[PDB]
Structure formats: structure tokens, C-alpha cells
Amino acid sequence: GAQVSTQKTGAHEIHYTNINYYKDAASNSANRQDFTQDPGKFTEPVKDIMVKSLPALN
Amino acid sequence: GAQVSTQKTGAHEIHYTNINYYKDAASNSANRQDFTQDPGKFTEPVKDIMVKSLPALN
Amino acid sequence: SDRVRSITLGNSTITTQESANVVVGYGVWPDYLSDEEATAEDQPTQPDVATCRFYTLDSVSWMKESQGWWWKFPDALRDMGLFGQNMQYHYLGRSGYTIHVQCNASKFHQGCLLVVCVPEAEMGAANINEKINREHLSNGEVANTFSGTKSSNTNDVQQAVFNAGMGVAVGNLTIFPHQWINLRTNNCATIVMPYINSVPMDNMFRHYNFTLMIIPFAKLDYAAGSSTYIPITVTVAPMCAEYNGLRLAGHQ
Amino acid sequence: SDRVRSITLGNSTITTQESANVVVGYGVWPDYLSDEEATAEDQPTQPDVATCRFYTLDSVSWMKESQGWWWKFPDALRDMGLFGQNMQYHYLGRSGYTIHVQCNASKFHQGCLLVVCVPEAEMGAANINEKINREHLSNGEVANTFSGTKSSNTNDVQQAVFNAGMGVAVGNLTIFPHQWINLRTNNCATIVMPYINSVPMDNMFRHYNFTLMIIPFAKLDYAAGSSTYIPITVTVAPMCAEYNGLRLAGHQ
Amino acid sequence: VVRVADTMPSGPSNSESIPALTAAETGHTSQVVPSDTIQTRHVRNFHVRSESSVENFLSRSACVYIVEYKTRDDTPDKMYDSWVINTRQVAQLRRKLEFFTYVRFDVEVTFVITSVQDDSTRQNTDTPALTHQIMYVPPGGPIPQAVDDYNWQTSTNPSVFWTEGNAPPRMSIPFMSVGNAYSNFYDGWSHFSQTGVYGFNTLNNMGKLYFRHVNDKTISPITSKVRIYFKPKHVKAWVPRPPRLCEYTHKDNVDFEPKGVTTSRTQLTISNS
Amino acid sequence: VVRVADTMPSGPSNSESIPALTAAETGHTSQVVPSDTIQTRHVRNFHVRSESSVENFLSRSACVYIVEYKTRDDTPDKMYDSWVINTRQVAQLRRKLEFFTYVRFDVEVTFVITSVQDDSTRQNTDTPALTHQIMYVPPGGPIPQAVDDYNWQTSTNPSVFWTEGNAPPRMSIPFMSVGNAYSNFYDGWSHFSQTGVYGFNTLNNMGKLYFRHVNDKTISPITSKVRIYFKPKHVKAWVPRPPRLCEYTHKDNVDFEPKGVTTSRTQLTISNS
Amino acid sequence: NVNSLEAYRIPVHSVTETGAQVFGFTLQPGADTVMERTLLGEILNYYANWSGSIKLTFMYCGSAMATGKFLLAYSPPGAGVPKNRREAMLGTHIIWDIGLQSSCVLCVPWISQTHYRFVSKDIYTDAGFITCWYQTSIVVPAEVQNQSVILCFVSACNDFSVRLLRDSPFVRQTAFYQ
Amino acid sequence: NVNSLEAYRIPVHSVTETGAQVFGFTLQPGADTVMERTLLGEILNYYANWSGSIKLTFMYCGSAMATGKFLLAYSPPGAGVPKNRREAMLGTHIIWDIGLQSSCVLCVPWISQTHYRFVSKDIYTDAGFITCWYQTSIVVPAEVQNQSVILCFVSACNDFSVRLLRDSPFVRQTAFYQ
């Protein structure tokens, strides 16, 4: 019941071990490898989206 | 001699490790994942079972 | 071009010729409660014509020295038609909104407003350990008003334009759905705000969902011959409304 | 057998164990307005859960000598919940009905009622050329009462059991949806009355659509040891309701 | 993975089918879903009856008896301390086990020991680590009679040595009933002439525990207090019963005083008051 | 593996396309890459927004409340010490959590206990190892009333025993909100007549902790101080808000005094001075 | 009447006009003074956060010749307690008749903001206010007694749940049971 | 002016000749006295080592009939602060006009020795010196006010980053909040 994933190392210069022990999900370790983002609902909160080339509400 | 089963997590949002160590069954952990039920011998303790549409001993 | 915008909701239509855009909340359009999030079990009433329509609130004036306004918005529509009745007779209510704020001025006028729709705007009191009365956080469609100085009244909301009531930095208050009514280009401002809450269906009297804040940054500066009285008119309309738990009237 | 009947409408359920049948009007089940008969053009509100439910009116007693009762029925539900509110805020209303009348008695009692649902029951006045007040044709859920003699009061409805108010022969009053609550077999009476009118959608304050008349033929005769107070309870429920023309409140 | 039942949709109805009318005079508990009274919508309900199972309800550590015994005194019976093994001396664990008539569980025992220094003239000592011995004794075993008696030797009996400053001891106990289930209720006598004792006590027969200090006669008495925490597991229970209303009186019977069935209202009909 | 955006090359331009001109009067935040103002080269940028995620930003252990209680005194309320569970009494952890309006996190609690010997006549004692009990109590549970009261038995409640000289205790707590997210902000009342208390306090309902010494009446009082370190994890947060400018006043409201928006410059235009 | 078997009898009798309140009680399975000691009340007193629908069942134990109809309402909160019958029929109700079928079922549905409630007495989660009402009176013939006894039963529907364990507030001991 | 809403207004008006300095400020998002309390300044006050490009956005909130052009420069350090307009246009600048488009964007690029900067005030890493300048004056016709208000906005580009956590220097408490 092992899980192997890459460590966090820098660019231009691994495969650790994770075994889930306790019988719950509140004992699972902190998911500190979620790098996902989408600034589409804090920027561009709009209908009729801009083009950046048109004069943008001319 | 490993056993893999799912953890208890909620709906809409695992696979832990269990190894049986000691040489008896009184050392095995508490089976806290038995969700089975049947209220057929505390409700409906009857012969000539009701239909819920018929007038039920008319 | 896209300066002419029309909005039809039921039997009330707003047509503006110098709009800016429509800010759709945090991207999510209003929707009825899908049954993956269903909590209560009895059938709700969705009027959809006598409720999803534009209701006009009171109009306030903007002189050279006015400081701000705030409206609580599940409460300012307490007594506006069948939205008010179906607020009263039920127990749980879920609805989106659609804010529209009319304010017009000529080309020889200048100034700029700021229309921010802050969720859960819990305001601090004027004194430190005093209980706020209900008639100072809201007054229905009667608008409250900020005070630019350090307000020190009894049983009163802490009125300060440089704190926005919550003690936040008022320049940083633009993370929410905001528009700028700069008076040189725009006639109005439109915010379509979906229903953000931690519970799926909530009551509409105990809870103040959000607060619409209009705070002027550029003051209404103009010549010595122009028209002084420049009003501000606000008209909103709920969306996707539904109501759960019909019971006897009143609230206590 | 078919003596046990259940009716579920919204969030109110009537279960009776000695019913008789369900008289469905003149054969026609209630229905929404199909658009071959459409007159007005704006979208109507069909609540269907907060309106189509059983509303209980006032209960009246039946002694040995009582003569009758009548209820106007677009008016007796003036102030019964959101049916009352959506009556008030609109201008045109269309709805079916479902009458249920509870009245129970033991086996050592005898007597027989008559539950007739007369459309357009225009009643004559007590004096010949006098104007009837509004508070004598109806009193809301407060029941009016026939008088067995020749009634001669001022500003009053002509109370006579042998004329049924309209001057018709009261024995011939069974052409309408009628049931007989004979107290030896039956616990209640059910009339599903569709909306009969010459206009497709009518107002619900100016017009009295129909009149429910309970007139006892066999008097409540019983021994010298039984329970005297035998009430009569009436509970109706609208069906297929819709409302056209939302406007400001009131009626004048 | 077992969910609770969902809600099915319903509509306007006029039927001879009557879910509201039932015969409670047969002992049959009616089975009306809320989709048969009013017009309920579609509800996809994801509740799981997880923490209400008979395993989850009783598998919590609960105290049964406090044991107090000192390391030096004047009398030999105030040194070590024994205890007859029973679960019916604290009303919480007993009341949780008295939902049922018969149960089948393995016991997992945990001892928690605290040492309190007594008051004397010479309390400023340099005391080493205390040591504790807990000798299980089956029914009919030898009787320890002192802290230095040679019956504490454990040639066969289960024992455990603990030193203060560690995690508390823990051992498991399998199912030791001679029948098939631990009888929390037995309506009968002991003698076949329907005499003797009435219990509830005829079928205890669990054996008894013993406690002593392994250390010798110290120059300062130390009051020791050990707490026993039973923790059942692998639990199967049969033929339930309603819980107990009146308070308890003793451990060897079921006797009580009558208690009112609830607390009064002083009204009978609710209103806005 | 998600990188930041690189830099695309640009050149001399004369277009009707205007990245510089935008309409900030619509609430749209402009999206000008530096490749549209001046002639930027090709940059292969390997920055990763790693230590700015909402998981990485809040998953640090932070103190919430210090608890002080002695092992023997004259009054029974200065022995054990309780605490009502809230995160809004220290401005650092509170200010880090008040970026958002609603959050969903599991709590991982760590207690750090220190023992200070008080001053008396007879401080030269031979003191054994102290022991600590931390009994969680759900909302509505029994009220402990002494250090020897029989409500400390933990027939069901979560507890932990620690002995001084080891690693500090640690336990996890799952998501316990009855809604869907811990409301750091609630604009509303408690009574449906829009009266009562205003909070922010109507939706706390977390239960309370309790602390006591398991050891008996010692011959010298020892001041015990335990520090609680919350450590959230598995964090999802919604609908953010700007941080707090003015200083805090209390724990059960949001009230304050007005603070100037920044510190002044005494000039407005920079120069070589 | 709690020091007797009298506490289970709900008396009901012929009235003068109509429409009175026989009984009525708050819906707090664990914090009430009515359903506190019932089996559902005991099990929920071992818990803290519950949810799901609750059935009531009303056996009529009168004579074999008397009839009568009874309005069995459920008023969700926000408003107070309905003081007359006209305010009572604007909630989830049922109109129950007495015939061969001696027992009714008022199946209280689930109308709630949150998923789960609280067992303990608090202000944020209030449930509903059962109030029983004469739809008609009790008509009984001669040589029969006037007054009778209604009983009440309680149970749970298919989607009932409990979440947090705790100790119940009913265990009140002082010392050990030697 | 910080005890008021006046602090956000940048005043600007018709000048006599040309070419004056309206405002000007150092580029230290976390150690400045200008962008210290802005949202970018707050988040970077929770960090220590940052990098990436910063956008400024300048809404013009004057009348609908006045025009004027404004030089929005960026002078990287090594030299001092440019004292006149001739020294100001030898950096990264932009020449912004006022028309229908009321808001500009000066997108400050990334010109740096190291990859990352420091939030705190230090000498080894200095950034740049924003200085705004009249390209022309403000020509306004009659019966309109002379003075107006420019606003400033701030944000971050696509490649902005932060590296080390710490505590922010804004939390100043003494005791607990009972």
C-alpha cells in the first residue's frame, strides 16, 4: 500500500515513500504540493470579455 | 501479509495499511467499519405482512 | 458598440446608454439549488415572475461633502412586494441578485464613485463595548451614511470612511465585485452577485447576507452655475429565488 | 374496500376512514389555462406548494335546531396564508378547489346534512329595495347562518331555509355537486369543484365565485345521555392556482 | 459503504391508498416515508449511519473502579489492594452496557497509576522509581496474604510490571464466559429449590485482581491510586431493552426507589408564553 | 509541476493595438505582460509559486491561549483551569485566518507544558514526575467542579495523559462545523427579532477544554503553564477579503478605534533628498 | 402525574363549540420535558448532532361508537406558537378521522437550514411546534362515557442519523456501589 | 490626510509653463510609506523574498472636457532621483494621453541583478523610483473647475513570486483579548 511521488527540488539541478497509517482522513498528511491556480474569477470577472487589442469599451 | 482497504471519508470530497501482528484474534483491532443493518425484526415482527396501501387489518 | 445594454427581468426593464460592463460576481451565474446540495425535503416555491423583477429603493443626494452609504441586502427589501411577503411567510430563502445603480451627470461635472458588494460585512460599533441597535445597521430602503471624521455616537455604527466599518483598509476594498462610476464616461454600474453563503438555504431576517457600499473617492466638483442636486438611485432585482418552510406570519 | 381515502396536497394530508366518494364537479378535473383560451399576456405565478394546500376555516356547532350555513368561497380565504397574500397583491386569479367537510357522530346519533356547492349564488335581500352590506353576505371564515322563519332584519340577507336565499325550491337544489352526510355511515364529504366562470381569469375580491351551503334536512336527534356539542369542520384546498397582473397592495 | 435512504418525489394525489391510517394495535411499527404526507422534492442524502453502530457505541475506554493502597503502613491489608472483577459499580459504563440482554465482547484493559507522597516528618527523601505488580487470579486461585507472601510468584498467572514514567500498560482479554454471552441480566436463583441469592450475581464468576508495590519497606509512605479502564471490542449484542430510569443502589442486585417518569411542565398546551 | 509564465520577445511596433489604454471603470483588472511596453528579451523563468499556496500559508503551528493552574492552593478554581475553544484571542493566527470569509480545515493540536516550582518554606522536596489530563468536552457536557470530582472519568470524552520528560502530545481534530465551513464572519443576530447578541459569536459553538493535575495534594505548589498550538491542514478557503488595518479590541466582536490609513511622508514629491 | 401511569393519557372530550388545543409541545428530542425520557430521547441523549425525519403515531383508545376529527399540525419556527386553529393550519398538518383505523401517522418531514441539529437546548437551531386541534368535537351516543384517552407514539424514518458521542445528562451518582 | 479619505486623491491642475513633478515614490512593496498598507503591500509583508513585475494603473477622474498628457517614468537605481523632466525621460517611461480611455497601464518590467529581492529596508537591493511628470499642462474650457483627481492602482504580472514566510510587522498587541 505504498505511494511514490517526486520531491520538491529546484530547476536545472527523489521519489520518496508515503504509507497511510491511521484509519481516518484527518490523520493524512498536509497536501503541500497543490500548485494549481486560475485568476479567472478575481481578474476578468466580466461578461463580454476584453481582447487587450480592441479599445475595451470604446 | 498486508491488507489494504479504504479510509472513512465523506461524500463529494485513502487505502491505508493493516498488518496483523500478534498470534491471536483478541489482539486484532476493532472492526469499526460494519455499517450493515436490517430493521426487519424490530419493525415488521409479524406474520401476514402489511402492504402500506391496503387498509392494514381492515 | 457595447455601451447600450438592456436587461429584462419579469415586467421591469432597465435601458442604459452609457453603461460600462456587467461584473458577474466571481464568475458564477445564479442558479437554483441542485439536489447534490439538498438539505431540507419539502417542496419550495419558485415564483419567478412576481419575485425576479426590479425593485427601486430610496434615492439619496450627493453634495460636495457627502461621505458614503451602505445598504444591507436581504433586509432593505423587507417590504417590497411579494418578495417581501414571501420573505415573511417562509423560513429559509435562497436568491441571487442583480444590482443596478443609476447616477447621471453632465460633461461639465466631475467625480467618481465606488460600488462594492461586500459579503458578510460585519461592522464595528462606535463605542468599544456597546450593543448596536437594529435601526442603525439598516433602516430598510432608507440609506445609512458614513461620517468622515471619528464618529463617537451612542448605540451607533463606527462611521469612518477610512475604515469601511469593518476596520479594513478602504483602499484595499476592491477585492469584491466592484465598479467605478467615474462621471466622465459612465451612466450606471451593474453587479450580478450570486448567493455566497456557508449554508445552502438560510433565513432572510436573522442573517444579513451582504452590504452594498457606495463610497465617493473623487468629490462632486463643479462650477458655480451647474445643477447642484445630483441624486443617486439604486434598483436591484433578485434572481433564481426559492423559499423553503412555509409557516405562520411574523418574525420573533 | 373504498371507504378509506387519503388526499395529499402540498404539506397537509386528510385521512378519513368512513368517506363516501369524491364528486369531481361536472366531470372536469382542474387544469391550468391552456393558451387557446389565453387573454392576458404577462407571465403568471404558479406557486403550487405554498398555495395548493388545505386551509382550515372556523368550526360551527350543530344543535337540534340549527338551520344552515353558507360560505362565499373566493372570499372566506381572504387572510389564510400566501393564498391570501397572492390574492391581495394580484389583479386576476384562477384556481380550482377541493372541499372537505369533517363532521363525526357515534352510532346512537342520527341526522343528515347536505353539502351543495352552488355557483353564482346571488342572494336576495330581506327587505325588497334595500342594499345588502358586505358583512352579511360573507364574514370571511366566520360562517353565516340561515333562519328558518321569515327573516325581516335591516340590511340583511333573506334568511329562509325553504328558499336557499336565491328564491329557488330548496328540494331542487341538488343539481349541483352535492353529497349527503347521513350520520349513520359517513364521516365526511368531498367535493372537487373546478372553476366555472364566463371569463377565463377573474378578480378574486370583486367577484364571489360560488357559495358552499350546508343545510340540515334530518335534525340532530339523539338520546338524553349522549354528547350534545357535535361540531362541523370545513377545510378546503385550492388547485391549479395562478395569478395575473401584479400591482400595489390593497383593494378599493 | 452504506448510505441512508433518499427522498423520492411525490405529487398531488387522490387515492384509496392510505399511508396515514395504520393499525398500531398489532405491534407493527408503521413505515411512512415523508414522500407520502406532503409534496417532498428529490433529496440526494449522503448521511452514513457510521458512528451509531454497536461497535462504535461501546468501544470507548471507561473507568470501573479506583484502587488505593500505600507502600508502608501499620496493617498488612492497607498495603496491597484487591478487587473482584465486575463492570457494575460505575453507572456510565454499566448504563451503556444495559441496553442489551446478552453481549459478546473481548476486553482490553488499561491501568493508569498515580503516586501521591504522604505527609510525615521526613518527606525530603531521594526516592527511586516505583514498580507495580498486577496479578490476575482465576476463580479458585491462591489468596495473597501479605506484600511478602510467596503467592505473588506467578508460576502461571497473568501479571504485568510497570515503572512510573512510561506509557500506561495495556493488555487484551478474550471472551471468558462459560456460556455463550456475558449475561447482563439473569432472572433466577442459585439453589434448585429457588432459594439462595437472586441475581445477576450467580453468573458473575470472573475472578479477581490484586495490586502491590514490588519495592520494599520505604522510609516514607506513598499513596498509590490505580484506575482500570475497560475497552470492549469485536462486539455482538442481542435482544435489546430500554435503558434504566431510576438511579442505581448496589452492585449485586437491581433494587431501587421509584422515580417520577420525567420532569413536569406545569402546563399542557403550548402558546407564545 | 507548474511554472510561472515566461517572457515573450517583442520589437519595434506602431499599431492601433493599445495594451496601455484600458477601462478600469468596469472593474476588469488589466493584464499587461511586460512584453508590451518596452522591448523585452526572451526569459526562461523557472519560478514556482510553491510557498504561497493556501495550504502552505496557514499550515504553521500557532499559539492561541496560555493556561495557568497550580497543583495545590487554597481555592478549588485556581487548581484546574478551563478554556473555551476559540481561535480569536491572538492577533497573529486570527489575522492570518481573516483573509477569508469561509474556510474548511482539520485541526491538529499540540500542547506544550512547563512546570515552575513556586516559592515556599519547604521547596527542597523529592518530587516525582507530574502527570496532566486534558479532557475535551463537547457542547453541553458535564461541568467539572473540582480536581477530585467524578466528572473527570472520561467514559466517552477525548482525553490525553502526558508525563513530563517526553515529546509533547499531538492529536488531530476533523472538520466539526455543523454547516459547511467555519464562519470567520457572520453578519446577523441570534434571535429572529433581530435582537440578542451580534456576532461572530452566535456561531462559535466549539466546546471547551479542561486541564488538571492527576497527582494528589503535593507538599509544594507547582505553577503549570500549558500552551496550545493549532495547526490546520487540508485547507480549502473561499471568497477572500482585505486584511485588518486597525488593532483588535475583544474576542466576541469586531469593534475598534479608527487608525490612520498609513504613516505620513511629510513630502509628496521625491528628490535626491 | 409523573408519579403514576396517568402521564401517558392525553384526555379529550366533547367541547361546546369547536377548535381547541388538546395538547402541544416543542420538538426537541433530547432537550424537551415531554420526549425527554422516551427511547428516542434516551438514544439522542447519548448523542449531540442529529438529523432526519420523525414519525408520530396516535392510537385512539376511546369507545367503539364515538367519532371525531383532529388537526395534527407542525409549525416550523421563525414565527411563534399558533394560538388558534386558523393560525395552526398554515403549517404542515394532517386531518385525521376516527373509524376502523384507530391510529394515525403524522410523518414530520425535514425542513432545515443545516444538515444536522443539536440535541442540547440552544437558540440557533429550533425545530417546530406540534399542536393538536379539534377539527370537530367528539360526538358520542347515549349510555357511553364522555371522556376518552389518546396515546402518542414516536419513532424515526428511513434517513435518521446521529453524529457525535458524549455522556448523557441522566447519570447522577455520588460514590461507588459497594 | 491619512485620518480621512483625502489620502487617495492625487491632485493635479493647470500649471504656468510645463514639466513639474506631481507625485513620486520609492518602489519598496513592504518597506515604503506609500504602498505599505495596500493589498500587495500586506501580502508581501507576510513574505521576505519576492520577484516579478508590478503593474500600476492610473484612472483619471477629472472632467469630461479637459485634456493633458503625463510622463510616467521608472528610473532604476545607481543614479539618484531625477530632479527635472529631462532627467526623467532617460528611463523606462510611458507618455499617457487622456481621452475616452480614462485609465493607463505602466507595466514596470523586471531589471535586476539577482532573481529575488528583499521586502525589508536594506541597501544591497534597491528597485526604482517612480516619478510622474507633466508632459503638457491641463487645458480646460470655461465654466469647469480647474483642479482634478488622479487615482493609482497596483497589481502583479504573470511572473510574480514570493519565497520565505515570516510574521508581518503590523501585529502589535500587549495582552490577551478577554
Q: Are D99 and D175 in contact (CB under 8 A)?
A: no
E174 and D CB contact within 8 Å: no
Q: Establish whether chain A is in contact with chain G, requiring a minimum of 3 CB pairs below 8 angstroms.
A: no
Taking only residues 221 to 250 of chain C, the set having a beta carbon closer than 8 angstroms to any beta carbon of chain D reads: 243, 246
Three-state DSSP state, H39: helix
Grid coordinates in use for E34?
A: 415523508
Nearest CA among G56, G13, G21 for reference residue G131: G21
DSSP state of E247: P
Give the residue carrying C-alpha cell 372537505: D100
In 10 A of CB E255, how many CB atoms?
10
Nearest CA among C165, C155, C243, C153 for reference residue C205: C243
In 10 A of CB F95, how many CB atoms?
19
Partnered with residue E110 across adjacent β-strands are E170, E229
Q: Where are the domains of chain B?
A: 1-58
Q: Are D177 and D25 in contact (CB under 8 A)?
A: yes
Q: Are H92 and H108 in contact (CB under 8 A)?
A: yes
Chain A contact partners (≥3 CB pairs within 8 A): B, C, F, H
| Distance (Å, whole) CA G19 – CA E249 | 48
| Distance (Å, whole) CA H150 – CA H60 | 5
| Beta carbons of A56 and H100 less than 8 Å apart | no
Cα nearest neighbour of E19 on chain D: D6
**Geometric angle at alpha carbon E38, from E36 and E40, rounded to 5°:** 85
**Geometric angle at alpha carbon C75, from C70 and C79, rounded to 5°:** 120
Phi-psi domain of F101 (left: phi exceeds 0; alpha: psi -120 through 50; beta: other): alpha
Grid coordinates in use for F62?
A: 500557532
Which residues of chain F are within 8 Å of residue H171 when distances are taken between CB atoms?
Answer: 91-92, 95
F170 and A CB contact within 8 Å: no
- State residue F198 phi and psi, 5-degree precision: -115, 120
Q: Where does residue F141 rank: exposed (0-12), middle (13-18), buried (19+ CB within 10 A)?
A: buried
Nearest CA among G94, D9, B58, G149 for reference residue E22: B58
Three-state DSSP state, C109: coil
Work out how many domains chain C is built from and give that number: 1
Q: Give the count of alpha carbons within 13 A of G146, CB side only.
A: 12
- Helix locations, chain D, DSSP H: 81-88, 134-137
- State residue D190 phi and psi, 5-degree precision: -125, 125
- State residue G102 phi and psi, 5-degree precision: -85, -15
Grid coordinates in use for E39?
A: 409534496
Q: Are D62 and D232 in contact (CB under 8 A)?
A: yes
Indicate the residue of C22, C175, C177 with minimum beta-carbon distance to A47: C22
| Distance (Å, whole) CA C220 – CA D125 | 69
Beta strands (DSSP E) in chain E are 13-15, 62-70, 81-84, 102-117, 131-134, 161-163, 170-173, 182-183, 208-213, 222-230, 232-238
Nearest CA among C108, C119, C118, C111 for reference residue C66: C111
Domain F1-273 has CATH 3.90.1300.10: no
Give the residue carrying C-alpha cell 503541500: A32
| Distance (Å, whole) CA H111 – CA H53 | 9
Taking only residues 99 to 118 of chain F, the set having a beta carbon closer than 8 angstroms to any beta carbon of chain C reads: 101-102
Instruction: Give whole-number Cα distances, C214 to B2, C66, F243, in Å.
Output: 64, 11, 20
Partnered with residue C218 across adjacent β-strands are C112
β-pairing verdict for B16-19 and C5-8: unpaired
**Residues 6 or more apart whose Cβ sits within 8 Å of residue G57:** E22, E24, E30, G103, G104, G105, G106, G152, G153, G154, G155
Positive or negative torsion for Cα G139, G144, G146, G147: negative
Nearest CA among C174, C185, H53, H95 for reference residue F21: H95
CATH at residue D84: 2.60.120.20
In 10 A of CB C95, how many CB atoms?
23
Three-state DSSP state, F94: helix
| Beta carbons of A23 and B17 less than 8 Å apart | no
Grid coordinates in use for B11?
A: 461524500
Cα nearest neighbour of D2 on chain E: E16
| Long-range contacts, stretch B12-17, CB < 8 angstroms, 24+ apart | B12/C36, B12/E46, B14/A20, B14/A25, B15/A1, B15/A20, B16/A1, B16/A20, B16/A21, B16/A22, B16/A23, B17/A1, B17/A19, B17/A20, B17/A21
Q: Are D57 and D142 in contact (CB under 8 A)?
A: no
End-to-end CA distance of chain C: 52
Nearest CA among G175, D58, H158 for reference residue F3: H158
| Distance (Å, whole) CA D145 – CA D133 | 16
| Distance (Å, whole) CA E225 – CA E66 | 7
**Residues 6 or more apart whose Cβ sits within 8 Å of residue E153:** none
Nearest CA among H172, H161, H127 for reference residue H40: H161
Q: Give the count of alpha carbons within 13 A of E173, CB side only.
A: 19
The sheet that has F208-213: what strands, in order across it? F81-84, F208-213, F131-134, F161-163
Grid coordinates in use for D7?
A: 388526499
Which residues of chain D are within 8 Å of residue C243 when distances are taken between CB atoms?
Answer: 50
Which residues of chain E are within 8 Å of residue D17 when distances are taken between CB atoms?
Answer: 21
Indicate the residue of C148, C172, C222 with minimum beta-carbon distance to H145: C222
Cα nearest neighbour of F136 on chain G: G166
| Beta carbons of D86 and C89 less than 8 Å apart | no
Nearest CA among F185, F183, F188 for reference residue F206: F183
In 10 A of CB F16, how many CB atoms?
7
Taking only residues 103 to 132 of chain F, the set having a beta carbon closer than 8 angstroms to any beta carbon of chain H reads: none
The minimum CA-CA distance between F200 and chain C, rounded to whole Å, is 8
- State residue C171 phi and psi, 5-degree precision: -70, -30
Nearest CA among G69, D240, D13 for reference residue E33: D13
Nearest CA among F183, H174, F247 for reference residue C167: F247
Three-state DSSP state, D138: coil
Alpha-carbon dihedral E126, E129, E133, E134, rounded to 10 degrees? 110
Nearest CA among H166, H164, H163, H133 for reference residue H150: H133
Q: Give the count of alpha carbons within 13 A of F261, CB side only.
A: 25
| Distance (Å, whole) CA F34 – CA H157 | 8
| Distance (Å, whole) CA C177 – CA C193 | 8
**Residues 6 or more apart whose Cβ sits within 8 Å of residue C61:** C229, C230, C231, C232
Written as one string, the DSSP assignment of E151-200 is: TTT-SSS---EEETTSPPPEEEE----SSSSEES---B-SSTTS-S--BS
| Distance (Å, whole) CA E175 – CA E181 | 9
**Geometric angle at alpha carbon E183, from E182 and E186, rounded to 5°:** 165
Three-state DSSP state, D112: strand
Chain E contact partners (≥3 CB pairs within 8 A): B, C, D, F, G
Which residues of chain E are within 8 Å of residue B52 when distances are taken between CB atoms?
Answer: 17, 19, 31-32
Positive or negative torsion for Cα G162, G166, G167, G169: negative
DSSP H or E stretch at residue F69 = strand F62-70
Three-state DSSP state, E251: coil
| Distance (Å, whole) CA C150 – CA D224 | 83
Indicate the residue of F49, F56, F261 with minimum beta-carbon distance to H37: F261
Q: Are E246 and E254 in contact (CB under 8 A)?
A: no
In 10 A of CB D133, how many CB atoms?
11
| Distance (Å, whole) CA E18 – CA C74 | 42
Beta strands (DSSP E) in D135-187 are 144-145, 178-179
Three-state DSSP state, B39: coil
Instruction: Give whole-number Cα distances, B54 to C162, D7, G128, in Å.
Output: 72, 15, 31
Indicate the residue of G15, G89, G136 with minimum beta-carbon distance to D104: G136
| Distance (Å, whole) CA H49 – CA H32 | 15
Three-state DSSP state, H44: helix
DSSP H or E stretch at residue D118 = strand D115-119
As a whole number of Å, the CA-based R_g of chain H is: 18
| Distance (Å, whole) CA H35 – CA G52 | 54
Q: Are F118 and F223 in contact (CB under 8 A)?
A: yes
Indicate the residue of D4, D7, D52 with minimum beta-carbon distance to E14: D7
Nearest CA among C204, C197, G113, C23 for reference residue F101: C197
Instruction: Give whole-number Cα distances, D233 to D53, D57, D192, D210, F42, in Å.
Output: 16, 7, 17, 19, 87
DSSP H or E stretch at residue H56 = strand H54-59
Partnered with residue C106 across adjacent β-strands are none
The architecture of the domain spanning G1-178 is: Sandwich (2.60)
| Distance (Å, whole) CA C204 – CA C95 | 10
Partnered with residue C61 across adjacent β-strands are C231
Instruction: Give whole-number Cα distances, A29 to B30, F97, F108, F172, in Å.
Output: 23, 20, 10, 11
- Scored b (16 or more CB within 10 A) or e, D48-84 reads bbbbbbbbbbbbbbbeeebebbbbbbbbbbbebbbbb
Nearest CA among A41, F156, C186, F79 for reference residue G165: F156
- Helix locations, chain C, DSSP H: 81-88, 134-137
**Geometric angle at alpha carbon H5, from H1 and H10, rounded to 5°:** 75
- Scored b (16 or more CB within 10 A) or e, E175-212 reads eeeeeebbbbebeeeeeeeeeeebbbbebbebebbbbb
Q: Where does residue H111 rank: exposed (0-12), middle (13-18), buried (19+ CB within 10 A)?
A: middle
Which residues of chain F are within 8 Å of residue A13 when distances are taken between CB atoms?
Answer: none
Which residues of chain G are within 8 Å of residue F155 when distances are taken between CB atoms?
Answer: 167
In 10 A of CB G104, how many CB atoms?
27
Q: Establish whether chain A is in contact with chain C, requiring a minimum of 3 CB pairs below 8 angstroms.
A: yes
| Distance (Å, whole) CA E93 – CA E86 | 11
D252 and E CB contact within 8 Å: no
The sheet that has G153-156: what strands, in order across it? G103-108, G54-59, G153-156
Q: Where are the domains of chain E?
A: 1-273
| Distance (Å, whole) CA H66 – CA F238 | 43
Nearest CA among A20, A5, A17, A29 for reference residue B17: A20
G39 and D CB contact within 8 Å: no
**Geometric angle at alpha carbon F166, from F165 and F172, rounded to 5°:** 140
E22 and D CB contact within 8 Å: no
F262 and A CB contact within 8 Å: no
